[PDB]
């Protein structure tokens, strides 16, 4: 049963120490990374991630906490129980990934507003071996795949220590429309990268997909639509007519183009 395999996935990261190498690929980027993952005797997870190609990007985490992170990952830093309501969870067979037997789960959207996944889960541990993000037509948007996974034996302490590049470290807006299952994760204010203006940020998620909304004042300027794509991440900007000079609404996230567009056109100011 797929529900059971996803619950096992949810807990696998606290019940297994491991080390491994994986690749991440999208249109325009291919990279290899290494991970060392140690579960301490009290259950805390200590994890180090290192990029193996090109620059030495790195992060070390202790449970949720970022202990250190390299600058190129940080310059813009300011639960599967309900998933079956928005995705059909299906065991579709068996596979072999990184020389290990796996089960294949198809996580298929129940509507047009989110992407699906093909997940390959390690039989021995429930850890993820392969994650493929698929669009509506079944085409591949991103590939996450281990090439080797070494489980059981815990990484040695020296393997959990990062290098020198790892640096020790109310908004008056709402959406009138969200796809089912998406909820507000967080809202906060930032500043425009260009001007003195405050920019409101809202972030949303359904447990699998996330998107962010940015609302920036136009001061009466005539600025039109924009759109962009970076692998699975769409960017849409649409002007919002307002009584305070207009706003540009930007939606960024791992959702179909039409979802980002519909969200962007549904943003509204809060009323008294």
């Amino acid at each position: 049963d797929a529900s059971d395999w996803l619950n096992r996935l949810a807990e696998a990261d606290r019940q297994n120490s491991f080390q491994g190498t994986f690749v991440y690929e999208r249109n325009g980027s291919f990279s290899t990374h290494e991970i060392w993952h140690r579960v301490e005797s009290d259950g805390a997870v200590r994890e180090r991630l290192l990029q193996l190609d090109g620059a030495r990007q790195e992060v070390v985490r202790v449970d949720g906490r970022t202990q250190c992170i390299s600058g190129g990952l940080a310059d813009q830093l300011a639960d599967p129980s309900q998933l079956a309501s928005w995705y059909d969870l299906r065991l579709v067979g068996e596979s072999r990934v990184a020389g290990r037997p796996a089960v294949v789960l198809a996580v298929t959207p129940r509507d047009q507003h989110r992407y699906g996944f093909e997940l390959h889960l390690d039989r021995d541990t429930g850890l993820p071996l392969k994650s493929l993000l698929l669009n509506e037509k079944g085409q591949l948007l991103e590939r996450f795949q281990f090439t080797q996974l070494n489980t059981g034996a815990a990484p040695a302490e020296d393997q959990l220590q990062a290098g020198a590049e790892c640096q020790v470290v109310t908004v008056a807006w709402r959406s009138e429309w969200l796809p089912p299952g998406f909820t507000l994760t967080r809202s906060f204010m930032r500043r425009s990268p260009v001007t003195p203006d405050p920019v409101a940020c809202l972030t949303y998620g359904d447990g699998l997909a996330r998107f962010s909304v940015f609302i920036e004042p136009l001061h009466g300027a005539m600025v039109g639509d924009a759109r962009s794509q970076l692998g699975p991440t769409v960017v849409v900007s649409k002007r919002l007519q307002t009584d305070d000079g207009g706003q540009m609404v930007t939606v960024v996230g791992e959702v179909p183009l039409g979802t980002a567009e519909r969200v962007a056109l549904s943003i509204r100011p809060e009323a008294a």
């Binding site: 990279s31 990029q51 310059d75 996450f144 972030t203 962010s212 600025v223 759109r227 960017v235």
Partner: protein, 44 residues
Amino acid sequence: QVITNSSSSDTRWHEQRLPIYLRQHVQQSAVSSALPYARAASLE
């Protein structure tokens, strides 16, 4: 990567903002779990 669109006034305006908001979304999603990190690392 800004498309675009068709107006040099609008391209210049969006090109100073959209890449930054994109980076913020992807980076914050990585710190909130190796897949989110990998997406952030794929930038630049």
